[PDB]
């Protein structure tokens, strides 16, 4: 219904409601405060954060889970530029985010060029200069964020546009069918002829709408699977016997050996940016691309067969047309048997008593004890990230947020807060180093204020270890990587959250269990002995 | 055997002596048959490497026209036409042509020379960031900074130009990259994706809307004209019997000879059959259409249900917010829709009356010639075997107004950016694709002189092109609007020329119509010339104000 | 009485009916005497408002040449030439011309139409973000989005074009802004700033360097040619007696007639007097020079102390990192330096020998004509009362090589971007500034046909321009380098034309040289024509490889 609106902000809020938005994250200011004011009259919850960067991280968590964009709302100038890192992180990981940023009155733009600053790190960036287009622009931002391979979108809203009246109407919010039957038959024939097929899963294969169809295709075909880190949660060792690990980080993965051995590779939901094809595509295998978009071709990614459409309907049709389960070639069996032994060796069953400060593998064990299938895990960036990534095969979480191609620090706690708001009846564990922690730890006030049931673990080394380990390897000396200690227990408690500090190994497991039982935000500082990190870092590409 | 194989004898991995050789080998894999351009030092190794190829070098006389010629090739073949130019002004002379191709959806790849990578940042070259200059007028614009990426970038440029909604693509080639060695292979070209149709539930939703509509109409856009959609479109029209109108970009997607309920074109006039059926419609089904082709505020009354069928979701703007989107392979969607239509449309009395009115067309000795006399004489020489290309100016409006009585099956007229000078270069490009057929190009005297340097190219090629000039000694399309708004003229009058002698100085055949009676015999004589000819036709534009009141005037730039 | 007064009867605050009227009033305040361009609907109110002004409307036949003509006006008058075009292709047709003006430092303001503000974002217009397209090739590019800013933006565009190091500036004018009402006043134009000279301690530092140098030389750039610096430059040269060489952008900053130690120009050759003195120098003092004019890697051996004198600090690049910078008003700095020079330079034997060698110049009946024969005949008709303009191609190198024996005081040849087509439009612009003087323009057949449409403009204006074509039926400058590198040619040959008849079809006088003996009498006859004339001169380019070995070959685009 074309309505007359007293304020553009009111039409904005009504469009947000049509988009299923449940919360907005951000920080108000004069240029944008009419949108904040209009939200008082809506069902949408206003969540003030303490740094705009984290509004973008929280929004990304909401977008990743729900498939509908999370929303950040900030004022002009620094409110917008404080989003840029967060928006680039969302765009890189495929998380649907819409950021609405205030701007000066249109008449004053003559006397920050936010659109130019956001264009390199968004799918869509635009400023509303014609009030008659307000709802169209917002709708287009959600469509850009949510459709295809999702990503981030930025809309600049001049103060006079959202304050003044407008004429317009709200616009209501699967958009593709399955790949054609002839293409399904073509792929099914290739599968029937292949001796060493393998599935390479990318981002879109991990979307919730695809989980049942993916499982049916794997159950029917029993074809080995390897996954990019964007798709780290699509399949795991505990739910598929022919899982070959995540590829992209470690130089000794079954998935890579199977990709090298393959005579047929079927990439599902995958874009080359997720794992450089020069690393895995020999060119000797027939290459099938299945995604919501055409292939992003490059010299090491020129598919022989290209299917575009609804992934679930496509995989369901494909499963319906596979004649027999794969019988592994002897080479493929050995690769997977090799990986079983690799996993046993990584478990370190017999070298199981430890020393202090805590050995990383001891911390991983204690984390895997408290993270079960009802718990979400978020992972920051740092040396601990490599440890957790190495042991993803033995984590059994509801969901793991870990993929981080920009390698942005500070993501874990805001990701966890956003994920908790989606399913607040559940617990979230976030883990970071001490460097990443302090880049977003201001949101502990937000977490206390929300009573968010988040447990944050800090691997404490008083430095930037992941950088130090590389400096030591290249130069045998450290520079800019050491800093001072903090009383993290007292730090957490000054916010009104529960604090814990692990003063002994034996206290590790009971402390984490005690922290998990807190109904609300808790922080646990865990001193770590990274001496053995060179051992793990040598397992990297 | 796989496309990416490093042991394919048809696409071997080689240590190429010059990156230019790999570029040329890649062009061959893209099906390129000729390149249009002007050489210079930075790009001359690509010109040289083309000597060892089956690809023909066609030197033009101004780079803008290389882009125009390439667009004609792209539109007709569906594979990108290619322009090749040197650094600096060789590149910047392409920008209007690349914008025109991108706006019309014509696949064009421009390869432009650049200074050596080490010299890029020197102040001498600060006013020629060509990627920044081409980004606003292309789908794809990139510079090759790594020799290993040479084939990938050229391949990706063709893929951007040709796939999705086609458009123009620019590649900057630094001199040291094309002159120096490279290791790599050609990337074999891929076809269109095997794309799902729209979802079945959405298609049923639209079938039900069709069953309930009293005045449905199909609005065809650019992608409806692609050959992969031809059979499916024909079958849907035969099964549904729903009327159809086409934007100018939809080209010959449908013709009156095959479908009795074709209402003609939309995009310029406000009062023709297609416009009246769109105004009457309770359901508009757009196929392969984007608002770039025809501003929706001009045709969408907001009273009809709106369906969007295309390979891409809609970009919602004012007056184009579809109620249902059918996203996917157009042919697959149309085939599924045709299966779910239970009966042929019984036209409303008003709709039947609109189409009957279009069927009626009753088919002037003043000198200078009346526009209608010129149109009628052109319709005599332009038969189904002849391609027609049309420039921009008042004559374009006359020709568009009576396009229904031209029987050329190949017409290049669509020109949303309203670029002058396009007609002769479009005609040369079209002739090169089908040299066994005559092309007739038509312009005003303003547009003629913006690209007439290519008459030398036409003579050198022996192109069978007849160019007609409507001569008024001014920029009439601008004058009409100035007279209407201000009742006085500014900047629209210039002096006369002897266009017969002008054409002959190129070695083309020249003609000038000096009386009304001489029009038709002169056109026949110029048509019988086997090679380039130019005919000047003095025109009396007195009646033009009456035609422009039938136009969407706000669209004129 | 103050410049910003709201009660100035000479610049009243008004409720203007149309923003276009305020634009035109602002142009009058900037001293604009004519505008070059092509109208269209979006911009036609500015054309209309010019009817009520003393400013002359000059319609051109291709927008590129409006930019070229404007550059000639800017260079000669020091106040920006003005191009006026419509939206879309009217704007994008300017880009090469704006880049050429910016690179040469010619002040040019282009006013381009645009769609109404409300329509800017519609998809039809997505390929014409003109500010983004012009930003890489201008000093200043902006769109007026607030009517209250109309005069400010036009004023600021002239200030960007004219002040500092001059260049080109673009203003986008939305149709609704120029058609609708505005409240405001004209902004009176300001002069150059009253700028301090370089600091006294730095000037003494350079005076001491002069006192110690055995082979000092002045290298003059663009800003040395500005009239405000003329007396100061002359006085410094007379006091110091230091030799001087000029980039091509320095124009007529110094001539051999006034200063006996002028070594000629640098920028193309590697072996002329200026190049040898720069190679010999222990001290190089650059005045008004920027590396954009002449790549420092070509001339700076790194063995001399380097002084930078300009209104702006240096931008340090490879081979241009000055040891002392004298930043400030050039005239003020040169006047202070002259006061601190204690004696005239005694030239070194080598330096004196270099200059003696330049003084020697001993001042061929084959057909086609030898280039040297053509140069010598041109030197007969080009006297101090005649302006000479020169296009790009091999003939440019010949003319540059013997520029020392042309006695025209006004020569437009500098062309770092190497843009073809410049000469005829430059000549028309120059003639409009001083219509009492003859202009001779010279091009090849390639460059001729890129701008020859302006022969109609020349005939319509009755411009006293003689255009000479060196005719080889190819793109020779490219062919020479292809032959040298590859020993074969590609894309450089085209067909012949009857240029006499070509010119006559415009109503210009045409001539064709058919024998060596006929060259000089034909040139004299074409020179005696009072109005536009064209002379075709067949040229034998066999010897060109010998000339190009004297060039910095890497500079050719
Ligand atoms: C925003 C940003 N800046 C720089 C960096 C650089 N950096 C990392 C990159 O991934 C590697 F270049 S990780 C990291 C943090 C290390 O500090 P902690 O969090 O304490 O973890 P620890 O390894 O000690 O366990 C850094 C600094 C960053 N990621 N992100
Ligand atoms: C490159 C360019 N500049 C300006 C315009 C604006 N314009 C549109 S039609 C036209 C007149 C064309 O004159 P002509 O070719 O002689 O056609 P006529 O209307 O006189 O028949 C102009 C100048 C344009 N469309 N393209
Ligand atoms: C717009 C443009 N395109 C290409 C070039 C490269 N180029 C430099 S000189 C030249 C040849 C010019 O031919 P012509 O005008 O006939 O002069 P000639 O050398 O034959 O005497 C070319 C194509 C250029 N400088 N400018
Ligand atoms: Mg972007
Ligand atoms: Mg740390
Ligand atoms: Mg672009
Ligand atoms: Mg005309
Ligand atoms: Mg700029
Ligand atoms: Mg030539």
In B278-353 the beta strands, taken as DSSP E runs, fall at 283-287, 305-310, 324-327
Is C483 touching B (CB cutoff 8 A)? no
CATH homologous superfamily of B364-557: Thiamin diphosphate (ThDP)-binding fold, Pyr/PP domains (3.40.50.970)
The catalytic residue among A87, A381, A401, A466 is A381
Rounded Cα gap, residues B180 and C365, in angstroms = 44
Chain position carrying tokens 């549904």: B240
Complete DSSP assignment for A507-533: THHHHHHHHHHSSS-EEEEEEB-GGGH
Whether the CB of A464 sits within 6 Å of ligand 1: yes
CATH of domain B1-194: 3.40.50.970
C266: which residues sit within 8 A by CB, 6+ positions away? Answer: C219, C245, C246, C247, C272, C274, C275, C278, C294, C299
Rounded Cα gap, residues C294 and C400, in angstroms = 15
Question: What is the CATH topology of the domain spanning A350-541?
Answer: Rossmann fold (3.40.50)
Angle between helices B95-104 and B63-77 (to 10 degrees): 20
Phi, psi of C174 (to 5 degrees): -60, 140
**C526 in Cβ contact with C537 (< 8 Å):** no
Spell out which residues have Cβ within 5 A of ligand 5, the ion.
A 433-435, 461, 465
The structure tokens listed for C479 are: 């062919």
Phi, psi of C287 (to 5 degrees): -125, 120
Chain C neighbors of A126, CB-CB under 8 A:
121
Rounded Cα gap, residues B412 and B427, in angstroms = 9
Phi, psi of A200 (to 5 degrees): -105, 115
The structure tokens listed for B99 are: 């914008």
Looking at the DSSP bridge assignments, the partners of residue C169 are C109, C140
Cis bond before residue C368 (omega within 30° of 0): yes
> In this structure, how many other beta carbons lie within 10 angstroms of the beta carbon of residue A133?
21
Rounded Cα gap, residues B351 and B461, in angstroms = 49
Count of positions (residues) in chain C: 557
Chain position carrying tokens 């312009």: B443
Dihedral, C422, C425, C429, C432 alpha carbons, nearest 10: 150
Is C121 touching A (CB cutoff 8 A)? yes
C286 is in an annotated binding site: yes
**B449 in Cβ contact with C453 (< 8 Å):** yes
Rounded Cα gap, residues B405 and B399, in angstroms = 10
Whether the CB of A465 sits within 6 Å of ligand 1: yes
Chain position carrying tokens 């019309």: B104
Please state the atom number of ligand 3 nearest to the C-alpha of residue C396. 21
> In this structure, how many other beta carbons lie within 10 angstroms of the beta carbon of residue A122?
27
Residue B281 to residues B249, B263, B315, B342: CA-CA distances in angstroms? Answer: 21, 13, 22, 20
The structure tokens listed for A46 are: 């206003």
**B227 in Cβ contact with B78 (< 8 Å):** yes
Rounded Cα gap, residues C540 and C5, in angstroms = 65
Complete DSSP assignment for A104-167: --HHHHH---HHHHHGGG-SEEEE--SGGGHHHHHHHHHHHHHSSS--EEEEEEEHHHHHS-EE
Rounded Cα gap, residues B36 and B83, in angstroms = 5
**What Rg do the C-alpha atoms of chain C give, in angstroms?**
25
Rounded Cα gap, residues C123 and B295, in angstroms = 8
C389: which residues sit within 8 A by CB, 6+ positions away? Answer: C72, C411, C412, C413, C422, C423, C424, C426, C427, C430, C439, C440, C441, C442
The DSSP bridge pattern shows strands C509-512 and C533-538 to be: parallel
Of C118, C121, C146, the CB nearest to A110: C146
Chain C neighbors of A110, CB-CB under 8 A:
144-146, 148-149
Rounded Cα gap, residues A367 and B21, in angstroms = 57
Chain position carrying tokens 């976030």: A430
**A210 in Cβ contact with A315 (< 8 Å):** yes
**A13 in Cβ contact with A101 (< 8 Å):** no
Examine the residue annotation and report whether A409 is marked as an active-site residue of this protein: yes
The catalytic residue among B378, B392, B412, B527 is B392
Looking at the DSSP bridge assignments, the partners of residue C440 are C388, C466
**B233 in Cβ contact with B251 (< 8 Å):** no
Q: Which of B132, B163, B193 best tests the A interface by mutation, with the highest count of A CBs <10 A?
A: B193
Chain B neighbors of C37, CB-CB under 8 A:
491
Nearest C-alpha neighbor of C286 from the set C256, C278, C270: C278
Q: What angle do CA B426, B430, B433 make, to 5 degrees?
A: 150
Rounded Cα gap, residues A409 and A429, in angstroms = 17
Rounded Cα gap, residues C110 and C81, in angstroms = 8
Of C121, C148, C149, the CB nearest to A130: C121
Helices vs. strands in chain A: H and E counts, helices first: 23, 20
Examine the residue annotation and report whether B420 is marked as an active-site residue of this protein: yes
Rounded Cα gap, residues C420 and C96, in angstroms = 10
Residue C436 gets which letter from DSSP? T
Residue B252 gets which letter from DSSP? T
Rounded Cα gap, residues C18 and B119, in angstroms = 48
Q: Which of B26, B194, B206, B307 best tests the A interface by mutation, with the highest count of A CBs <10 A?
A: B194
The dihedral built from the CA positions of residue A508, A513, A514 and A515, taken in this order, carries a sign that is positive
Rounded Cα gap, residues B72 and B461, in angstroms = 16
Residue A541 to residues A300, C208, C435: CA-CA distances in angstroms? Answer: 18, 61, 74
Nearest ligand (C-alpha, residue B68): 2
Of C47, C135, C557, the CB nearest to B40: C557
Is C485 touching B (CB cutoff 8 A)? yes
B146: which residues sit within 8 A by CB, 6+ positions away? Answer: none
Q: Which of A108, A130, A155, A166 best tests the C interface by mutation, with the highest count of C CBs <10 A?
A: A130
**C289 in Cβ contact with C166 (< 8 Å):** no
Rounded Cα gap, residues B232 and B326, in angstroms = 15
Rounded Cα gap, residues C213 and A46, in angstroms = 75
Burial track C481-493 (b if 16+ CB lie within 10 A, e otherwise):
bbeeeeeebbbbe
A541: which residues sit within 8 A by CB, 6+ positions away? Answer: A249, A250, A251, A279
Q: How many angstroms away from the CA of C97 is the closest CA of chain A? A: 27
Rounded Cα gap, residues A292 and C145, in angstroms = 40
Nearest C-alpha neighbor of B38 from the set C193, C475, C202: C475
Rounded Cα gap, residues C154 and A432, in angstroms = 55
Nearest C-alpha neighbor of A183 from the set A313, A299, A325, A300: A313
Rounded Cα gap, residues A54 and A71, in angstroms = 12
A475: which residues sit within 8 A by CB, 6+ positions away? Answer: none
- Please give the distance, rounded to the nearest whole angstrom, from the Cα atom of residue C286 to the centre of ligand 5: 55
The catalytic residue among C69, C98, C420, C477 is C420
Rounded Cα gap, residues B69 and B423, in angstroms = 9
C290: which residues sit within 8 A by CB, 6+ positions away? Answer: B123, C165, C221, C222, C310, C312, C315
Complete DSSP assignment for A464-507: -HHHHHHHHHHHSS--S-B-----HHHHHHTTTSEEEE--SSTT
- Please give the distance, rounded to the nearest whole angstrom, from the Cα atom of residue A393 to the centre of ligand 6: 43
Chain position carrying tokens 């967060």: A86
Q: Determine whether the interchain pair B329/A180 forms a contact, defined as Cβ–Cβ distance below 8 Å.
A: yes
Query: For chain A, after which residues does the C atom lie more than 2.5 Å from the next written residue's N, i.e. where is it broken?
Result: 111, 173
Nearest C-alpha neighbor of B67 from the set B28, B32, B39, B96: B96
**A95 in Cβ contact with A72 (< 8 Å):** no
Phi, psi of B468 (to 5 degrees): -105, 135
The structure tokens listed for A274 are: 């997720």
Rounded Cα gap, residues B31 and B43, in angstroms = 21
Question: What is residue B32's three-state secondary structure?
Answer: coil
Q: What angle do CA B138, B141, B147 make, to 5 degrees?
A: 155
Query: For chain B, after which residues does the C atom lie more than 2.5 Å from the next written residue's N, i.e. where is it broken?
Result: 363
Chain A neighbors of C121, CB-CB under 8 A:
126, 129-130, 133
Domain with CATH 3.40.50.970 in chain B: 1-194, 364-557
Domain with CATH 3.40.50.1220 in chain C: 195-363
B201: which residues sit within 8 A by CB, 6+ positions away? Answer: none
A46: which residues sit within 8 A by CB, 6+ positions away? Answer: A23, A24, A36, A39, A40
Question: What is residue A390's three-state secondary structure?
Answer: helix
Residue C103 to residues A214, A487, B291, C139, C224: CA-CA distances in angstroms? Answer: 60, 62, 39, 10, 16
B262: left (phi over 0), alpha (psi -120 to 50) or beta: beta
Residue B37 to residues A216, B419, C450: CA-CA distances in angstroms? Answer: 55, 19, 13
Looking at the DSSP bridge assignments, the partners of residue A499 are A523
Is B258 touching A (CB cutoff 8 A)? no
Domain with CATH 3.40.50.970 in chain A: 1-175, 350-541
B283 is in an annotated binding site: yes
- Cα A104 to its chain centre, rounded Å, is 33
> In this structure, how many other beta carbons lie within 10 angstroms of the beta carbon of residue A337?
12
**C338 in Cβ contact with C510 (< 8 Å):** no
Is C57 touching A (CB cutoff 8 A)? no
Residue B552 to residues A363, B50, B299: CA-CA distances in angstroms? Answer: 72, 47, 10
- Please give the distance, rounded to the nearest whole angstrom, from the Cα atom of residue A82 to the centre of ligand 1: 19
C195-363 under CATH 3.40.50.1220, yes or no: yes
Nearest C-alpha neighbor of A407 from the set A389, A392, A419: A389
Task: Mark out the alpha helices in B284-329 (DSSP H runs).
Answer: 296-299
Please state the atom number of ligand 3 nearest to the C-alpha of residue C445. 16
In B242-395 the beta strands, taken as DSSP E runs, fall at 244-247, 262-266, 283-287, 305-310, 324-327, 387-390
CATH of domain A176-349: 3.40.50.1220
Q: What angle do CA C521, C526, C532 make, to 5 degrees?
A: 170
The structure tokens listed for B169 are: 């693509």
**B117 in Cβ contact with B145 (< 8 Å):** yes
Complete DSSP assignment for C381-424: H--TT-EEEE-SSHHHHHHHHTGGG---SEEE---TT--TT-HH
Could you tell me which chain A residue has the CA closest to the CA of C153? A110
Rounded Cα gap, residues C557 and C541, in angstroms = 20
The structure's method of determination equals X-ray
Chain position carrying tokens 């009259």: A41
Rounded Cα gap, residues B529 and B504, in angstroms = 13
- Cβ neighbourhood burial of B201 (10 Å; 0-12, 13-18, 19+): exposed
> In this structure, how many other beta carbons lie within 10 angstroms of the beta carbon of residue C462?
12
Cis bond before residue B368 (omega within 30° of 0): yes
- Please give the distance, rounded to the nearest whole angstrom, from the Cα atom of residue A460 to the centre of ligand 5: 6
Question: What is residue B242's three-state secondary structure?
Answer: coil
Chain position carrying tokens 């020799």: B147
Sheet with strand C533-538: strands edge to edge: C410-412, C387-390, C439-444, C465-471, C533-538, C509-512
C48: which residues sit within 8 A by CB, 6+ positions away? Answer: B482, B485, B486, B488, B490, C20
Looking at the DSSP bridge assignments, the partners of residue B494 are none
Rounded Cα gap, residues B235 and B334, in angstroms = 8
Half-sphere exposure at residue C349, Cβ-oriented, CA atoms within 13 angstroms: 0
B103: which residues sit within 8 A by CB, 6+ positions away? Answer: B292, B416, B417, C127
Examine the residue annotation and report whether A461 is marked as an active-site residue of this protein: yes
The structure tokens listed for A174 are: 């699967």
Rounded Cα gap, residues B339 and A160, in angstroms = 51
C102 is in an annotated binding site: no
In B301-350 the beta strands, taken as DSSP E runs, fall at 305-310, 324-327
**A103 in Cβ contact with A117 (< 8 Å):** no
Residue B123 gets which letter from DSSP? G
Examine the residue annotation and report whether B543 is marked as an active-site residue of this protein: no
**A522 in Cβ contact with A492 (< 8 Å):** yes
Whether the CB of A86 sits within 6 Å of ligand 1: no
Rounded Cα gap, residues A265 and B94, in angstroms = 42
Architecture of domain A1-175: 3-Layer(aba) Sandwich (3.40)
Nearest C-alpha neighbor of B538 from the set B485, B450, B476, B482: B476
Chain C neighbors of A141, CB-CB under 8 A:
none
Express the helix, strand and coil content of chain B in percent, nearest 5 each: 45, 20, 40
Residue A360 gets which letter from DSSP? H
**B363 in Cβ contact with B446 (< 8 Å):** no
| Model resolution, angstroms | 1.8
Question: What is residue C184's three-state secondary structure?
Answer: strand
The structure tokens listed for C459 are: 């005939």
Residue A354 to residues A362, A363, A395, B65, C267: CA-CA distances in angstroms? Answer: 7, 11, 21, 76, 75
Question: What is residue C305's three-state secondary structure?
Answer: strand
B101: which residues sit within 8 A by CB, 6+ positions away? Answer: B67, B70, B71, B74, B107, B108, B167, B168
Rounded Cα gap, residues A461 and C137, in angstroms = 53
Helix/strand/coil (H, E, C) string of C322-355? CCEEEECCHHHHHHHHHHCCCCCCCCCHHHHHHH
Selected residues 167-226 of chain B with any CB under 8 Å from a CB in chain C:
none
A343: which residues sit within 8 A by CB, 6+ positions away? Answer: A237, A393, A394
**B115 in Cβ contact with B432 (< 8 Å):** no
Chain C neighbors of B92, CB-CB under 8 A:
95-96, 99, 137
């Amino acid at each position: 219904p074309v309505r007359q609106w007293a304020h553009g902000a009111d039409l904005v809020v009504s469009q947000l409601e049509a988009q299923g938005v449940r919360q907005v994250f951000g920080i108000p200011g004069a240029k944008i405060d009419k949108v904040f004011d209009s939200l008082l009259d809506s069902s949408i919850r206003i969540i003030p954060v303490r740094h705009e960067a984290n509004a973008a991280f929280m929004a990304a968590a909401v977008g990743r889970i729900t498939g509908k964009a999370g929303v950040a709302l900030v004022t002009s100038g620094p409110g917008c530029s404080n989003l840029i890192t967060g928006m680039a992180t969302a765009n890189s990981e495929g998380d649907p985010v819409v950021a609405l940023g205030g701007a000066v009155k249109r008449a004053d733009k003559a006397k920050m060029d936010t659109v130019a600053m956001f264009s390199p790190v968004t799918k869509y960036a635009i400023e509303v200069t014609a009030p008659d287009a307000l709802a169209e622009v917002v709708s287009n931002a959600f469509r850009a964020a949510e459709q295809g391979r999702p990503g981030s979108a930025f809309v600049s809203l001049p103060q006079d546009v959202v304050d003044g009246p407008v004429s317009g109407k709200v616009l209501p919010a699967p958009q593709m069918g399955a790949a054609p039957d002839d293409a399904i038959d073509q792929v099914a024939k290739l599968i029937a002829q292949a001796k060493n097929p393998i599935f390479l899963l990318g981002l879109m294969a991990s979307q919730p709408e695809n989980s049942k169809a993916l499982r049916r295709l794997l159950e029917t075909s029993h074809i080995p699977v390897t996954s990019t880190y964007q798709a780290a949660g699509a399949v795991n060792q505990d739910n598929f016997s022919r899982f070959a690990g995540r590829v992209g980080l470690f130089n000794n993965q079954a998935g890579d050996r199977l990709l090298q051995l393959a005579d047929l590779v079927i990439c599902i939901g995958y874009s080359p940016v997720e794992y450089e094809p020069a690393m895995w595509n020999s060119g000797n295998a027939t290459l099938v691309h299945i995604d919501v978009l055409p292939a992003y071709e490059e010299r090491n990614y020129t598919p022989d067969v290209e299917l575009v459409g609804d992934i679930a309907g496509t995989l369901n049709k494909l499963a319906q047309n596979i004649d027999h389960r794969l019988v592994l070639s002897p080479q493929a069996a050995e690769i997977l048997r090799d990986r079983q032994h690799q996993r046993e060796l990584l478990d370190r069953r017999g070298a199981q008593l430890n020393q202090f400060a805590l050995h990383p593998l001891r911390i991983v064990r204690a984390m895997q004890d408290i993270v079960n299938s009802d718990v979400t895990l978020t992972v920051d960036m740092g040396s601990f990230h490599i440890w957790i990534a190495r042991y993803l095969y033995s984590f059994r979480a509801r969901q793991v947020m870990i993929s981080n191609g920009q390698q942005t620090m500070g993501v874990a706690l805001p990701w966890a807060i956003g994920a908790w708001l989606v399913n607040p009846e559940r617990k979230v564990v976030s883990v970071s180093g001490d460097g990443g922690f302090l880049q977003s730890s201001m949101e502990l006030e937000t977490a206390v204020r929300l009573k968010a049931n988040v447990l944050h673990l800090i691997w404490v080394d008083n430095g930037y270890n992941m950088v130090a380990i590389q400096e030591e390897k290249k130069y045998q000396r450290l520079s800019g990587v050491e800093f001072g200690p903090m009383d993290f227990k007292a730090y957490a408690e000054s916010f009104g959250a529960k604090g814990f500090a692990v003063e002994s190994a034996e206290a590790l497991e009971p402390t984490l269990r005690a922290a998990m039982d807190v109904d609300g935000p808790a922080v646990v500082a865990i001193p770590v002995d990274y001496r053995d990190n060179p051992l793990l870092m040598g397992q990297l590409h």
